[PDB]
Scaffold this active site. Structure first.
Site, PDB file in Angstrom:
ATOM      1  N   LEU A 266       0.831  -1.195   0.000  1.00 32.75           N
ATOM      2  CA  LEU A 266       0.000   0.000   0.000  1.00 32.75           C
ATOM      3  C   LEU A 266       0.869   1.250   0.000  1.00 32.75           C
ATOM      4  CD1 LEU A 266      -3.157  -0.543   2.220  1.00 32.75           C
ATOM      5  CD2 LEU A 266      -2.850  -0.648  -0.257  1.00 32.75           C
ATOM      6  N   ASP A 267       0.298   2.354  -0.471  1.00 35.46           N
ATOM      7  CA  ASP A 267       0.993   3.629  -0.440  1.00 35.46           C
ATOM      8  C   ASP A 267       0.838   4.284   0.932  1.00 35.46           C
ATOM      9  OD1 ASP A 267       2.356   5.922  -1.078  1.00 35.46           O
ATOM     10  OD2 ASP A 267       1.165   6.398  -2.859  1.00 35.46           O
ATOM     11  N   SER A 268       1.626   5.338   1.160  1.00 41.58           N
ATOM     12  CA  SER A 268       1.482   6.113   2.388  1.00 41.58           C
ATOM     13  C   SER A 268       0.145   6.842   2.421  1.00 41.58           C
ATOM     14  CB  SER A 268       2.639   7.103   2.524  1.00 41.58           C
TER      15      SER A 268
ATOM     16  N   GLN B 193      -2.241   4.593   3.696  1.00 42.69           N
ATOM     17  CA  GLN B 193      -2.133   4.513   5.149  1.00 42.69           C
ATOM     18  C   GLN B 193      -2.888   5.649   5.827  1.00 42.69           C
ATOM     19  OE1 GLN B 193       0.375   6.246   7.535  1.00 42.69           O
ATOM     20  NE2 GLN B 193      -0.492   5.025   9.208  1.00 42.69           N
TER      21      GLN B 193
END
Ligand code: CDL
Ligand code: CDL
Ligand code: PLX
Ligand code: PLX
Ligand code: PEE
Ligand code: 8Q1
Lengths: 175, 70, 53, 56, 459, 178, 88
Positions: G42-44, G47
């Site tokens: 997943l990307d930040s 998140q």
């Protein structure tokens, strides 16, 4: 009630209407005041009668104090201290009595305003006009004396007022 | 549910003790005073105004109405 | 002491002044006198000084 | 126990003694200002059959 | 009058012959008994006075002040019991001796048929207070505070002695009764102007008048709790009593002489009330509030009307009681924290709820909430000033609003919010402190039931 | 709150913070859930276009006009959670928080109630008394010379050791004591 | 109030529920200990949206400094339990 004089505190005859029920519905006010009478006014009356008979079992009296008249400040010598003291005490007593007279008139005015209801502006002219006279007199006698008031200062104020009145009368007559 | 927790709070002992002591002493002297005043009012007091009989001079405390004042 | 102060006798003479005022107003209303008088002392007993200006 | 608590509690009597002494001194000083007793023009009164002084 | 004076004098040998562990109990009991005797004086007449002898008289202006003075000593002893625990018996006896001597001087000052006797006792009160301030004081500025307190008063009051001896040489008497009965007007002359100034400045400096109030914050902050109590409660009212007694001979000169002082007081109440908003010390804030109240009392005395005098008497009594209670609360906080800073100890209502209730009641009484006698005096003086001039209402309203503001600021800063985390030595309040606050506050709410007892001779 | 702060914020953290603020204020503007989902997806699409940009100067020039655009349209009355520093119940229960040391001043008649609780409290006191003496030396030996460079504390490394400066973090009153 | 005393099991169940409602992450692959960047790719930004979804689910909001280092569901549950003082 005999506890106060009716002439000092006049009251109108207090004419009241008679109940004229126009319908057959029984109003709740009469029933509520009857139950109020039964549950309140009777025990209170009984207790009052008991207390009154207990008071009548032990009766004793108290008297109003009478004060003699003494020479006033206008007939006291310049440095005579005893007559000045007596005149000052008499003047102070007279000042208290005048204050209470004004209090009586004010009480009359307030009672008239409350009693007359919506027509007070017309039915209380007499009390208002009496209060106008009494306030004018009281104001002339004691206004601007200051915290350290005395009979000498009141006499000086009266003296200057009479000098002004005499001068005005002389100027008007000789106009 | 047996989830009864502890409530952390300051000690209420001394405040309550002071209040109880103050009430105790105030009542200790005020209750007899109230009882005495009530007994005097029901049994004795409330003199009535009169005129001074001729030839009689009253004492200084006979010019007052309430018995405690006299 | 609070009870003592509450029941202090009237050395300030308030009800006495009430009775005096009541009797004076009764007398004056009945006799037609106009209540309180503007002059505290009767002018007959003051000797004003003649100006002659 | 008497004659022992007195040695520690004798001090308590002092303020009260002072009060009665002050009352006595007030009356004694009052006794010296009777120059006008029953001579005021307001309370000038004839004495009672068993009265020597109007006030003490 | 000796039935009060002699027991107060006998308090000294009783204290000095007491056991090492029974001085406080005996002193408190006998002081309370003396106070009960003083209650008899309140009965007053609408006529001249209670002339006991050639030396002393009582009046309905002096009676409430005497009652307050006699009542204050047990409270001062209760407050002083705490911080003098580690003191030798001789020095504690000396402290009690100083308090008793101060009470005796005040009692003889308030009766004082003759003006030079009044001056002598009015100056004799200066020594025990100075010793208390400069001996049992915590900080190092107590010496400078005592110097200020001594020299302001003496510089103000030295011309008063010359004025009094001149007045006696000219008139021939300084007995207050003869002075009142033989009063004569003052001609508008430079000599009369300076005589007026010499008669007025001594009482003005002790009020304190705005601009001459510098000594008061120093003396109040550096004094021990008993000294602060007496200074705020009784010693400030000496100037007002003296002005009320002496303005009888200053007429008609007072009508125009009063303007500089009226302007100073009317602007200085606003100034000191605003100063109270930015203060980091409880004692300094209470002292400046006292300055504002006494400035308004100065305005009342200068207006010189019956309502002014009644309001001034009522406000003097109410301010004495309220300031004493506030100082006692501040001292209770200080003896726990040892800092005397508002922002250090916070959120004390969570830890001490009953003391927070005492704080709230004291702040409400200082705020002049009706029908407290504080507002009775405040409102009478406001009405008299409005009759004097309709423009005073702006300044009076500003003062009222700022007064409420800083009173509630002082309450909220110390009692509300979150407690300071690192302070963990805040023990439960003792019964002694609670009884002290109760005995401060209950007489106020009892006196509001009989306001005529504190309205003075012009009631 | 719990984590120790850093000396500065990097570009990536600032970009994340702006993204969160913009999403929150867009949700505040768009009350309804479907509209918010649409505009949040559009916001993400507009947001990640410059994801792959490389040089620092243009990246710093960006996020700045973005902050200005955010400030122009920042919804002057955003939604706030009730317990947040701006919420309607931020410090509602802070008057019910009493410290633990207040129990040391309870009257013995009060301590007679709850005996087991006070026995456990005494055990905790003994544990703290030993652990503090261990922790002082542990922190003295572990700290870099010249003073700490950050307000981050080390965990316990021995067997019987406890984390340094633990007493006032473990013994919090509660979130809602009453 | 009348708020039930939520437990650790309820917090974990709710976190996993909201995570399984996230279409980007496959339900089978995720585990209480499953990391975000590496285990699920997943990307930040993903998140931060996960943090916002947690915030909307539990009705309280996490500061950014704490949120930016919450990388597993297990430590998210631990953070929530520590914040709300959950016993078991
Ligand atoms: C903080 C606290 C600090 C405290 C500090 C200490 C206190 C300091 C101050 C003390 C001052 C005491 C004082 O001055 O007393 C004042 C005063 C003293 O009386 P007084 O003026 O000397 O006497 C007047 C007359 O000369 C005589 O009147 P009378 O003879 O007609 O009256 C009869 C008599 C007795 O009257 C009766 O017996 C009968 C009256 C009621 C009868 C009702 C009917 C009952 C019968 C029916 C039911 C049973 C029989 C039937 C059964 C069958 C039914 C079916 O009256 C009394 O006994 C009154 C007793 C009052 C006691 C006051 C004591 C004060 C103590 C001070 C310290 C107190 C410390 C606290 C503890 C105090 C104790 C709790 O007492 C009162 O003012 C009473 C007030 C009544 C108020 C009525 C309600 C008013 C509400 C208006 C406002 C409403 C809207 C808001
Ligand atoms: C309104 C009529 C009331 C009739 C009932 C009689 C009440 C007797 C009270 C006697 C005086 C209070 C003494 C002051 C210290 C309180 C002692 C204490 O610590 O309490 C612990 C005790 C036990 O509680 P706790 O849980 O153990 O303690 C936990 C904390 O303390 C936490 O405690 P807390 O959170 O509950 O707070 C303590 C409480 C208590 O602390 C206070 O602040 C109470 C004092 C408020 C006055 C502040 C000065 C303002 C000027 C008023 C001066 C007038 C006084 C009248 C004569 C008084 C005679 C002594 O504070 C308050 O509740 C807020 C007070 C704000 C009220 C503002 C309204 C004042 C003007 C109303 C006009 C009054 C005359 C009416 C005229 C027209 C109608 C005829 O609680 C109480 O019993 C509370 C006292 C009752 C409340 C009094 C509120 C109004 C009464 C004022 C005086 C009586 C007026 C006479 C007219 C009657 C008709
Ligand atoms: C805590 C929870 C509540 C419990 C308590 C419940 C009961 C409530 C009662 C408390 C107040 C309610 C108001 C009720 C008032 C009734 C009493 C009142 O009528 O008495 C007053 C009387 O009170 C006293 O006059 C005032 C108290 C005295 C104050 C002196 C202070 C004591 C000395 C301490 C040192 C002084 C320090 C300050 C220096 C000046 C006014 O009476 P007054 O209409 O007038 O005439 C008396 C009757 N006469 C006609 C026969 C003469
Ligand atoms: C510092 C903090 C505050 C401390 C307290 C301050 C209060 C003290 C202020 C004193 C009050 C005023 C003093 C005199 C007032 C009289 C009115 C007079 O000044 O006004 C004019 C007076 O004109 C001129 O002012 C003449 C005086 C000029 C010299 C005075 C110095 C002016 C400033 C000094 C202030 C210093 C105060 C602090 C001293 C250390 C009226 O003209 P005139 O009709 O002809 O005189 C009427 C009086 N007669 C009838 C007796 C003749
Ligand atoms: C907080 C510090 C305040 C200090 C006090 C400030 C004011 C001091 C008052 C002035 C000082 C002298 C008082 C006068 C004493 C009363 C005697 C009197 O009134 O008689 C006058 C005497 O009047 C004078 O002699 C006054 C002379 C002044 C000399 C001293 C100057 C002191 C400073 C004066 C200016 C400051 C005053 C106000 C200060 C403001 C506050 C700081 C008339 O004298 P005779 O000759 O007998 O009658 C005339 C017909 N033949
Ligand atoms: C209603 C409110 C009004 C809305 C106005 C707001 C305007 C915002 C639009 C600005 C768009 C931008 O991003 S401005 C462009 C600024 N420069 C860069 O983005 C360069 C590198 N990007 C990163 O490093 C990021 O952190 C990223 C890779 C995304 C995550 O990384 P993770 O792998 O660590 O999650």
């Amino acid at each position: 009630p005999d506890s106060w004089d009716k002439d000092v505190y006049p009251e109108p005859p207090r004419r009241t209407p008679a109940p004229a029920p126009q319908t057959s519905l029984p109003n709740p006010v009469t029933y509520l005041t009857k139950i109020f009478d039964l549950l309140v006014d009777r025990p209170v009356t009984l207790a009052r009668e008991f207390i009154e008979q207990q008071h009548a079992k032990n009766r004793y009296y108290y008297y109003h104090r009478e004060f003699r008249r003494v020479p006033d400040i206008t007939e006291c010598e310049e440095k005579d201290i005893l007559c000045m003291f007596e005149a000052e005490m008499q003047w102070r007593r007279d000042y208290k009595v005048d204050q209470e007279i004004v209090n009586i008139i004010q009480e009359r005015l307030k009672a008239c305003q409350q009693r007359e209801g919506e027509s007070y502006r017309q039915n209380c002219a007499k009390e208002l006009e009496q209060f106008t006279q009494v306030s004018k007199a009281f104001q002339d006698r004691y206004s601007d004396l200051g915290a350290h008031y005395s009979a000498r200062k009141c006499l000086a104020k009266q003296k200057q007022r009479m000098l002004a009145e005499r001068k005005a009368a002389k100027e008007a007559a000789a106009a | 549910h047996g989830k009864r927790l502890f409530i952390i709070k300051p000690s209420g002992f001394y405040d309550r003790r002071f209040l109880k002591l103050m009430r105790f002493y105030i009542l200790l002297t005020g209750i007899p005073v109230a009882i005495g005043i009530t007994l005097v009012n029901v049994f004795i007091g409330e003199a009535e105004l009169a005129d001074i009989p001729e030839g009689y001079v009253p004492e200084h405390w006979e010019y007052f109405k309430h018995p405690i004042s006299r | 002491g609070s009870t003592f102060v509450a029941y202090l006798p009237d050395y300030r003479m308030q009800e006495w002044a009430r009775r005096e005022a009541e009797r004076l107003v009764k007398y004056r209303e009945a006799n037609g006198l106009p209540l309180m008088e503007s002059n505290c002392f009767d002018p007959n007993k003051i000797q004003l000084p003649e100006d002659e200006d | 126990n008497v004659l022992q608590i007195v040695r520690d509690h004798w001090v308590h009597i002092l303020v009260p003694v002072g009060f009665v002494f002050g009352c006595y001194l007030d009356r004694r000083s009052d006794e010296k200002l009777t120059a006008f007793r029953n001579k005021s023009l307001l309370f000038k009164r004839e004495l009672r059959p068993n009265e020597e002084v109007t006030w003490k | 009058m000796l039935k009060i004076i002699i027991p107060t004098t006998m308090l000294l040998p009783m204290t000095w012959m007491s056991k090492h562990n029974m001085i406080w109990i005996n002193a408190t009991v006998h002081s309370l008994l003396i106070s009960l005797i003083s209650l008899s004086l309140l009965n007053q007449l609408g006529e001249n006075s209670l002339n006991f002898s050639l030396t002393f008289f009582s009046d309905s202006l002096s009676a409430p002040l005497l009652v307050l003075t006699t009542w204050l000593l047990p409270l001062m002893l209760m407050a002083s019991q705490s911080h003098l625990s580690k003191e030798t018996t001789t020095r504690k006896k000396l402290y009690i001796t100083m308090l008793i001597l101060l009470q005796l001087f005040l009692i003889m000052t308030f009766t004082a048929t003759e003006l030079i006797l009044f001056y002598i006792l009015f100056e004799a009160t200066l020594v025990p207070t100075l010793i208390i301030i400069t001996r049992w004081g915590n900080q190092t500025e107590r010496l400078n505070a005592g110097l200020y307190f001594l020299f302001y008063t003496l510089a103000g009051s030295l011309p008063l002695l010359v004025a009094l001896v001149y007045i006696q040489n000219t008139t021939g008497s300084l007995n207050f009764l003869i002075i009142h009965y033989w009063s004569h007007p003052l001609s508008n002359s430079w000599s009369n102007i300076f005589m007026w100034l010499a008669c007025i400045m001594a009482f003005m400096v002790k009020m304190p008048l705005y601009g001459l109030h510098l000594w008061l914050p120093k003396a109040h902050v550096e004094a021990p709790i008993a000294g602060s109590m007496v200074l705020a409660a009784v010693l400030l009212k000496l100037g007002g009593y003296g002005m009320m007694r002496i303005t009888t001979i200053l007429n008609p000169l007072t009508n125009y002489m009063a303007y500089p002082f009226l302007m100073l007081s009317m602007w200085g109440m606003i100034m000191t009330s605003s100063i109270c908003l930015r203060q980091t010390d409880l004692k300094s804030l209470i002292a400046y509030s006292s300055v504002s109240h006494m400035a308004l009392v100065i305005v009342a005395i200068m207006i010189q009307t019956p309502w002014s005098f009644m309001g001034a008497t009522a406000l003097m009594i109410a301010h004495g009681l309220t300031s004493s209670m506030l100082f006692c609360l501040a001292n209770t906080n200080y003896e726990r924290v040892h800092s005397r800073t508002m922002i250090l100890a916070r959120g004390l209502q969570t830890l001490l709820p009953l003391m927070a209730t005492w704080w709230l009641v004291a702040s409400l009484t200082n705020l002049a909430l009706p029908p407290s006698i504080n507002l009775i005096g405040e409102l009478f003086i406001i009405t008299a000033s409005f009759s004097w001039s309709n423009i005073t209402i702006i300044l009076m309203g500003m003062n009222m609003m700022i007064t409420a503001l800083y009173s509630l600021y002082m309450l909220i800063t110390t009692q509300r919010g979150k407690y300071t985390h690192h302070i963990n030595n805040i023990k439960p309040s003792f019964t002694r402190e609670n009884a002290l606050m109760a005995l401060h506050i209950l007489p106020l709410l009892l006196l509001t039931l009989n306001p005529k007892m504190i309205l003075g001779p012009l009631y | 709150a719990f984590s120790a702060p850093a000396a500065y914020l990097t570009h990536q953290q600032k970009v994340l913070r702006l993204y969160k603020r913009a999403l929150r204020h867009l949700e505040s503007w768009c009350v309804h859930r479907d509209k918010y989902r649409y505009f949040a997806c559009l916001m993400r699409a507009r947001f990640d276009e410059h994801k792959n940009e490389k040089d620092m100067v243009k990246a710093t020039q960006l996020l700045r006009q973005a902050e200005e655009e955010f400030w122009y349209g920042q919804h002057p009355q955003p939604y706030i959670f009730p317990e947040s520093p701006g919420g309607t119940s931020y410090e509602r229960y802070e008057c019910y928080k009493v410290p633990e040391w207040c129990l040391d001043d309870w009257h013995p008649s009060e301590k007679a109630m709850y005996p087991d609780y006070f026995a456990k409290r005494e055990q905790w006191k003994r544990l703290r008394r030993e652990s503090w003496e261990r922790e002082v030396k542990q922190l003295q030996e572990e700290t870099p010379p010249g003073g700490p460079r950050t307000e981050a504390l080390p965990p316990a490394r021995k067997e019987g050791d406890l984390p340094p400066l633990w007493w006032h973090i473990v013994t919090r009153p509660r979130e809602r004591p009453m | 109030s009348d708020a039930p005393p939520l437990t650790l099991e309820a917090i974990k169940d709710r976190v996993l529920y909201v995570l399984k409602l996230y279409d980007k992450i496959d339900p089978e692959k995720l585990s209480v200990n499953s990391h975000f960047m590496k285990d699920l790719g997943l990307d930040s930004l993903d998140q931060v949206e996960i943090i916002m979804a947690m915030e909307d689910e539990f009705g309280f909001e996490i500061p950014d400094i704490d949120a930016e280092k919450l990388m597993c569901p297990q430590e998210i549950v631990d953070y929530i339990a520590d914040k709300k003082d959950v016993y078991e």
